[PDB]
Structure formats: structure tokens, C-alpha cells
DNA sequence: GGAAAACACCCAAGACACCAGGCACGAGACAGAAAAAAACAACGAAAACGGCCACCACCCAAACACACCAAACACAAGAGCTA
DNA sequence: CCATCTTTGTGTTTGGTGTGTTTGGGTGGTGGCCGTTTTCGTTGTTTTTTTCTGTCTCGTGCCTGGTGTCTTGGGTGTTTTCC
């Protein structure tokens, strides 16, 4: 439990990008492969894609671990994903 | 509903005539809001293994929907 | 000479006016709008580098960081409800704990 | 090549605000899309109402009611009344 | 016209939970769907209220109303919109 | 490609949770969570490529992502725009 | 004979009423050709669509009055329909009947 | 000052759906709306895009990349479709 | 070429889920109370239209200085080790 | 966590120019102003009506305590795959 508070300290006063670049630039490819072939993708476009996913699943993580904190829990549920997906209005 | 309308806008400036089809679109508006605010709040609701809904579900609601900050 | 000068004003209100003729917005700009518009800009500049500075002097830094920035930003009431719906990049989360979840 | 930038009057308002602070590049294109992006709002708010009411010409009273319609709070307050005195001292100068 | 918030009854918002398919209501939810209620009218009013100012006008019209809603988000169909 | 959104490694998904302050995790949600990436990222690339094709390009720039992104509801700082 | 354009292309929409709002709506100095057909046949493709699903669901009440209640019906029971119309409230519409399952007692 | 609207275009097409079925003034007013906003959406994200490309015409092309960004799924690909044949058909006429 | 970090495996500890019990609190119905709703008339603030009249912004043309690029050297605080 | 010797790479300043902002005058019309009409918004009065308010009884849904187990968390050594 210690190490749990020692890593949200951590990763809450910390500035750079937890998700690996190379996972996700050979994800972002693979997915625009599917639209168009023959893609090419400047290094900024992927960063930007990176900044923007990282900070919709920081919020997403946030009002889940409200909805897991309504239900008397501690620990997040899939059910948690989406009723939060459900109430912001993805489908 | 008229009376409170009319209550909300005299704090800005008074002599301000409201045309019926405004009251309306009003009330229009504001059963909407409350009926999908209601539908999130039982959601909520169910979440939490109950059936009855309670304001900290209607706080939640907002809050999660960035209603509220 | 310049009617930023005229009007005691840092933004250029020569650009300003160029933006909105060429913008496509309408098909006449009056003499006031650039003005105005170029105040607005500087009040809301300043007051959001005010508080950027502020941030960074508490974080005994020398350079406004975009971390500065994102902090200055979420700890305002009206400047975080105007901004609710931007992220900044290599800002981060502002850090905030739940009271129930501390430990016993 | 030949690209515009906010750069030189941010400059001008940090060191008016905090003469010893410096800043950083990312930071100040930060700034740069803050002030084009409050810009677009303004703008294209003052252009909506300007169809609204059937005019052709951008005043600064519809620049003042798009500030009071956008910005929340004492914020829209404070700027009305900076706008309101660059304007009259651009008049009476 | 003096405290007419007590006007939206119990009954009524009892009415518009239930629309929702809520079953049970608690005792003290009344005071907070009042609030919330209030608080949306009173953005809205606002918005309307500046809206109509700009025009020069001292009776708000329909048309202020739909686009002051439609500015957030809230876009109604049926009143000329 | 075949099967790379596996890529996204289950630690990082705990550095994401834990930057959101989320104390205890499932077993269940990285499953979930990669499901919703791979929702999220498919919407944004749809718009983006879009924009390169009408623009007659081949190669997707970061301000394409940065409208599409905006034009989301998701609009970024410090890329231009 | 000076045929309209609407005629021309075998539309029901005006093209020339949306070649004139398209120019008169402060977008570009000069408007193509194609766009007021193009824009003028999205618009019938989509109104086709709504119009005849809130016939069909007229047609299950037992009504020949098309009302904002089976326009609501159209709209809400259709996915991409109700993902494109998300964000508007059909005035005199109500509510779709749905009662959760857990909701209901055993 | 006769104000403009939809409405004859819009019964046109419904007795082309449903030529047993009328329609309410409320309704009527309401698919009005419908189309008027649908309108203003698709020019305001054609201006845009024209405008990002430094372009100063609104063409089909335009038009349909709009119809693209817009419609969900397979209304657009329908819209798009029967758009192309609309203008295909107006280019073989004169 | 390089090195930091995911991943499989093995112990442990504690929060979730279920059961049981109790309490209290909205739900349901009858009676009494309220005032909302509809019809109807009067007064008049004010909105839409029209006609006039003028100051304000667009358009061409000439001019010069602020803001850009190139290029230079400075110095904030990041690297590791101390306390 | 802050602090100090030493590094460095990126912030800050400075010269040249070209392009963009500034001055001058002329025209045409958008918009301000006034005046008239007349639609509609408010304010006031009466009856039927139907809902709202209050009170009494009580069924069952919400909250709390106990067990245990299984689910996740922590540590370690390695290969590997990202930089």
C-alpha cells in the first residue's frame, strides 16, 4: 500500500510521457494502415496523437477511481470504464 | 415556472417583457436537462447497488460531467 | 505613430485589424474592434503569465515551464473554466489525492 | 521563411509583469495558441452576432458583448473595462 | 416576486425524476434539483439577457433563448431555430 | 501488423492509473483500457487522414492532428494551430 | 424554356435557394458549381431518411399525424442517427421507454 | 417580407416516401430546423477546411469531404454517393 | 551498440462479497387547502417599417521603420555526489 | 529534499533588410435618428377545476458488523527490446 501512495506522488509531480513511443508509433501506424496504405507520418503528428491519448486516459482514470470511490471500493472495476464512458457519452 | 424565470432575470435589469414562445423554449430546456440529469443520477444509483437515488449521486453526475468543477 | 502607441498598447493592433479583414468574418471592421480586441488579448495575457510567474517563483524556478503553465491554469477558478476543455502538452496532472484514500 | 508569431509582445508583458523571469520556447508556443485560439473565439463570436442582428460592420460593442458572452466571471469584467479605457484613450489621443 | 423557488412543488420534480426511470426519491434530493435547476436558468437567463442587450431590445424573444442554448451545447429544434 | 495493441505494456497502464491516483487495479481493466485506446485512437485517425486526403498529401502533419483533435472537442497547445 | 437547376439535376430541394444562401452566408468570395447540388442532395438524402423512418414509426401507432413524438421515436432508435443528432432536444418529443432490468423486482 | 422556408420541399419528399402520411405544423417546423442547422454545420466545416488549404472556392469536393468529417458510418457513405450521382447527373445535362 | 525495464514465478495480506440483523424513512391513501388555469377586457411600452442625412470605412498610392533571419555569446539548472 | 562544481544547449541580443504598417485624400453607403403604426405583453377580475399540502400507518430498502478467501501486491533475477 506504501508504494502505491510513494508511486501516485511520483507520476503526480512527474512531467513526461509514460507510454513507450515505439508501441505506440508502430499502433498508430497500424491502425492508419487500414484507412490508406502507403502512410506517411511526421514525428510531431505522433507526439501530438502520444500528449492528447495520455491525457484523455489520465481524465478517463480519474472519474473512474470517482466511480470505484462512490460503489465504498478502493479498487477500479471495467464496470467503472463504463459507467464513466456511459455518463461523458461515448458509446 | 414563469414567476421564477422572470425572478433569474429581474437580478440583471428589470423592464424585461418575456414573450411566451421564450418561456417555452425554456421550460423545454430546462425538462430536458432535468430528465437526462435524472437518468445519469440512477445510473449512478444502480452503480452503487442501490435503487433509491441520493444528492451525492446528483454531485457526482454534474462532476463527472464536467458540469460541475 | 503606431496606434499601439496611441491606444498605450504592447499588441500590435495593426495585426489585429489585418487579421480581421482578411479572416473573413465580415465585410466591414470599425476603428474600435482592433483596439479592443488587442486590450482583451493583453489583459488576459498578463494575467495568465502573472500567475505563471507566480507558480514558478513558488517552484523556485528561474523559466516559466508549460508545468508552470498547467499549474497556473488549474488553480484558477475562471481561468480553468474557460479553459476546461484544453489539454495542455508536457503539463501533466495538477496533484490532487482523494481525503479517504490516505492511510491509517 | 516568413511565419508570425506573438513572441516579441509576450516578451513585452512578461517583462512588464516579472522583469526577471524568463520563459520557455514550448511555453511560448503555448502562449502563441492561447492568443489565436481566444482570438478565433472572439472573432468569430462578434462575426456571429454581427449576422445576427443584420450589420456589416465589426464595432466595438459587438467585441465587448462577445467578451462579456465568452470569458466567466469577474474575468469578463475586468476586460470590459480595459477595453473600454484603451478605447477612449485611443479616441482622445 | 419574492422566493418562488418553492414553486417547482414536490410533486412535479417527483413527475421528472420519474421520466427517468427512477424508482425511489430521497427526502432530501428536492433542495439540490432545485439548485441545479436554478443554476441552469440562471446561465441561461444570463446569456439570453446579454443577448437581448446587444439588440437594443427590452423584451427577450425566442430567438435569443435558442441561440443562447444552442452557444451551449443545448441545441432546440422547433421554436425557428 | 498482426496483434501489436498488446504492445501497450500492462505496466503502463498502472504508471497511467497511477498518475490519475488510483490506488488498487483489477485484473480486468488493461483489457478494457486498450479497447478504449484503440476507440479513441481510431476516431482521431480517421479524422486526421481524412484531412490529408482532401489536402492531396501523403504524409499526415501534426497540424491535420491538431484540427481533427479540435474539431473532437479536444483541442491541443503547443503544436501549432 | 429556363429550366430550374433542381429540375435539371433531378432534385426536389432548390438549389438555386441554397446557391444563394451558401453566397450570401459570408463563407468565400466565390462559390463552385457542384456545391450547391451536392449540399442541395445531402440535405434530400437526410430528410428522405428522418421522413420516412418517422413515417414507419407513425405507422406501428396506428396514426397518419406525424407528431415530434415519432420524430423523437426516428431519431433515438436509430444508432448513427441518434449519434449525429446527439447533442439537440426535440421540443414535444419526450423520453424512449426504458426501465433497467435489475431495476425490476423478482 | 414573406420569410422563407422548407416546407413544400419537405411535404415534396415525404408524399415521395409516404403518400398516405401527412404531418403536423409543429413537425414541419422541427424538420425546418433539422435542415437548417444540418445546413449551417456543413457550410461552417466546408469554410473552415477551404479556409485551411488557403482556398477560396467551395466546391463538390469540399462539400463532400464536410459530408465525410459529419455524417456517422453509413449515412455518409449513402450521402456520398447519391451526392456523386446529383452532380454527375447536373455535368451531363446542361 | 547499450542498458533499463517488462515478465514469469512465488509468498502473503487484506479488501470484497455475502449473510444476518435492525432501523428508519419515504410510499400510499384520505382529508383539507390552494391557486393554476381559462376567459375576458384595457392601457400602453415598444417593435417593425420608412425616409433622411451624414460620418465612417474602403481603395489607391507613396513611404519608412518594426519585425524578421543570421549569427553571435552567455548562463539556468541538469548531471552526479553530500548531508 | 536542497545544495555546489562542472556542462551544455538553448535563451537573449544585435546588425541588415524587406515587407508590412502608416499617412494622405477621395467616394459611397451603412447606419444613426426621428416619427408613425399597431401588435402584443402586462396587469387585473371571476369560476371551475385539479393538484398540492398535511397527517397517519407501515413495508422494505439502506446501513452496519463478521468471515474468509481469493485476488492483487511485493520482491527477485533474467532476457529482451526500446533508445
Given at each position: 500500500?506504501?508504494?502505491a501512495?510513494?508511486?501516485?506522488?511520483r507520476?503526480?509531480?512527474?512531467?513526461?510521457?509514460l507510454?513507450?513511443?515505439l508501441?505506440?508509433?508502430?499502433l498508430?501506424?497500424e491502425?492508419?494502415?487500414?484507412?490508406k496504405?502507403d502512410?506517411?507520418?511526421?514525428?510531431?503528428?505522433?507526439?501530438?496523437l502520444?500528449?492528447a491519448?495520455?491525457?484523455?486516459?489520465v481524465?478517463?482514470?480519474?472519474?473512474?477511481?470517482?466511480?470505484?470511490?462512490?460503489?465504498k471500493?478502493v479498487?477500479?472495476?471495467?464496470?467503472?470504464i463504463?459507467?464513466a464512458?456511459?455518463?461523458?457519452?461515448?458509446? | 415556472?414563469?414567476?421564477?424565470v422572470?425572478?433569474i432575470?429581474?437580478?440583471?435589469?428589470?423592464?424585461?417583457?418575456f414573450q411566451?414562445?421564450?418561456?417555452?423554449?425554456?421550460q423545454?430546456?430546462?425538462?430536458?436537462?432535468?430528465?437526462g440529469?435524472?437518468?445519469?443520477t440512477?445510473?449512478?444509483?444502480?452503480?452503487?447497488?442501490?435503487?433509491?437515488?441520493?444528492?451525492?449521486?446528483?454531485?457526482?453526475?454534474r462532476?463527472?460531467?464536467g458540469?460541475r468543477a | 505613430?503606431?496606434?499601439?502607441?496611441?491606444?498605450?498598447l504592447?499588441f500590435?493592433?495593426?495585426?489585429?485589424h489585418?487579421?480581421?479583414?482578411?479572416?473573413?468574418?465580415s465585410?466591414?471592421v470599425?476603428?474600435?474592434?482592433?483596439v479592443?480586441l488587442?486590450?482583451?488579448?493583453?489583459y488576459?495575457?498578463?494575467?495568465?503569465?502573472?500567475?505563471?510567474?507566480?507558480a514558478?517563483?513558488?517552484?523556485?524556478?528561474?523559466?516559466?515551464?508549460?508545468?508552470h503553465?498547467?499549474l497556473?491554469?488549474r488553480?484558477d477558478?475562471?481561468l480553468?473554466?474557460?479553459?476546461?476543455?484544453?489539454?495542455?502538452?508536457?503539463?501533466?496532472?495538477?496533484?490532487?489525492?482523494?481525503?479517504?484514500?490516505?492511510?491509517? | 521563411?516568413?511565419?508570425?508569431?506573438?513572441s516579441?509582445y509576450?516578451?513585452?508583458v512578461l517583462?512588464?509583469?516579472?522583469?526577471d523571469?524568463?520563459?520557455?520556447?514550448?511555453?511560448?508556443?503555448?502562449?502563441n495558441?492561447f492568443?489565436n485560439?481566444?482570438?478565433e473565439?472572439?472573432?468569430?463570436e462578434?462575426?456571429?452576432?454581427?449576422?445576427?442582428?443584420?450589420?456589416?460592420?465589426?464595432?466595438?460593442?459587438?467585441i465587448?458583448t462577445?467578451?462579456?458572452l465568452?470569458?466567466?466571471?469577474?474575468?469578463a469584467?475586468?476586460?470590459?473595462?480595459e477595453?473600454?479605457?484603451?478605447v477612449?484613450?485611443?479616441?482622445?489621443? | 416576486?419574492?422566493?418562488?423557488?418553492?414553486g417547482?412543488?414536490?410533486?412535479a420534480i417527483?413527475?421528472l425524476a420519474?421520466?427517468?426511470?427512477?424508482?425511489?426519491?430521497?427526502?432530501?434530493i428536492?433542495?439540490?434539483t432545485?439548485?441545479?435547476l436554478?443554476?441552469?436558468?440562471?446561465n441561461?437567463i444570463?446569456?439570453a439577457?446579454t443577448?437581448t442587450?446587444?439588440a437594443?431590445?427590452k423584451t427577450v424573444?425566442?430567438?435569443?433563448?435558442?441561440?443562447?442554448?444552442?452557444?451551449?451545447?443545448?441545441?432546440?429544434?422547433?421554436?425557428?431555430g
Amino acid at each position: 500500500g506504501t508504494v502505491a501512495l510513494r508511486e501516485i506522488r511520483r507520476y503526480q509531480k512527474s512531467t513526461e510521457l509514460l507510454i513507450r513511443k515505439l508501441p505506440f508509433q508502430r499502433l498508430v501506424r497500424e491502425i492508419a494502415q487500414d484507412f490508406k496504405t502507403d502512410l506517411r507520418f511526421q514525428s510531431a503528428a505522433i507526439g501530438a496523437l502520444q500528449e492528447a491519448s495520455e491525457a484523455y486516459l489520465v481524465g478517463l482514470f480519474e472519474d473512474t477511481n470517482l466511480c470505484a470511490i462512490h460503489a465504498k471500493r478502493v479498487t477500479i472495476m471495467p464496470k467503472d470504464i463504463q459507467l464513466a464512458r456511459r455518463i461523458r457519452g461515448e458509446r | 415556472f414563469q414567476r421564477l424565470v422572470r425572478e433569474i432575470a429581474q437580478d440583471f435589469k428589470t423592464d424585461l417583457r418575456f414573450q411566451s414562445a421564450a418561456i417555452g423554449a425554456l421550460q423545454e430546456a430546462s425538462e430536458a436537462y432535468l430528465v437526462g440529469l435524472f437518468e445519469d443520477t440512477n445510473l449512478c444509483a444502480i452503480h452503487a447497488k442501490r435503487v433509491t437515488i441520493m444528492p451525492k449521486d446528483i454531485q457526482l453526475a454534474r462532476r463527472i460531467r464536467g458540469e460541475r468543477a | 505613430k503606431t496606434r499601439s502607441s496611441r491606444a498605450g498598447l504592447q499588441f500590435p493592433v495593426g495585426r489585429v485589424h489585418r487579421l480581421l479583414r482578411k479572416g473573413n468574418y465580415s465585410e466591414r471592421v470599425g476603428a474600435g474592434a482592433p483596439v479592443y480586441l488587442a486590450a482583451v488579448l493583453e489583459y488576459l495575457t498578463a494575467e495568465i503569465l502573472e500567475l505563471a510567474g507566480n507558480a514558478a517563483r513558488d517552484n523556485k524556478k528561474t523559466r516559466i515551464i508549460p508545468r508552470h503553465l498547467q499549474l497556473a491554469i488549474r488553480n484558477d477558478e475562471e481561468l480553468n473554466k474557460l479553459l476546461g476543455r484544453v489539454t495542455i502538452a508536457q503539463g501533466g496532472v495538477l496533484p490532487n489525492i482523494q481525503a479517504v484514500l490516505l492511510p491509517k | 521563411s516568413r511565419k508570425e508569431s506573438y513572441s516579441i509582445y509576450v516578451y513585452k508583458v512578461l517583462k512588464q509583469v516579472h522583469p526577471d523571469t524568463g520563459i520557455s520556447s514550448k511555453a511560448m508556443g503555448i502562449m502563441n495558441s492561447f492568443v489565436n485560439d481566444i482570438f478565433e473565439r472572439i472573432a468569430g463570436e462578434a462575426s456571429r452576432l454581427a449576422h445576427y442582428n443584420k450589420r456589416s460592420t465589426i464595432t466595438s460593442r459587438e467585441i465587448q458583448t462577445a467578451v462579456r458572452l465568452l470569458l466567466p466571471g469577474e474575468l469578463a469584467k475586468h476586460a470590459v473595462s480595459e477595453g473600454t479605457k484603451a478605447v477612449t484613450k485611443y479616441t482622445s489621443a | 416576486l419574492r422566493d418562488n423557488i418553492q414553486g417547482i412543488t414536490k410533486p412535479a420534480i417527483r413527475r421528472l425524476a420519474r421520466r427517468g426511470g427512477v424508482k425511489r426519491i430521497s427526502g432530501l434530493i428536492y433542495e439540490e434539483t432545485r439548485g441545479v435547476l436554478k443554476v441552469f436558468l440562471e446561465n441561461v437567463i444570463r446569456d439570453a439577457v446579454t443577448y437581448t442587450e446587444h439588440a437594443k431590445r427590452k423584451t427577450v424573444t425566442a430567438m435569443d433563448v435558442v441561440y443562447a442554448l444552442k452557444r451551449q451545447g443545448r441545441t432546440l429544434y422547433g421554436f425557428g431555430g
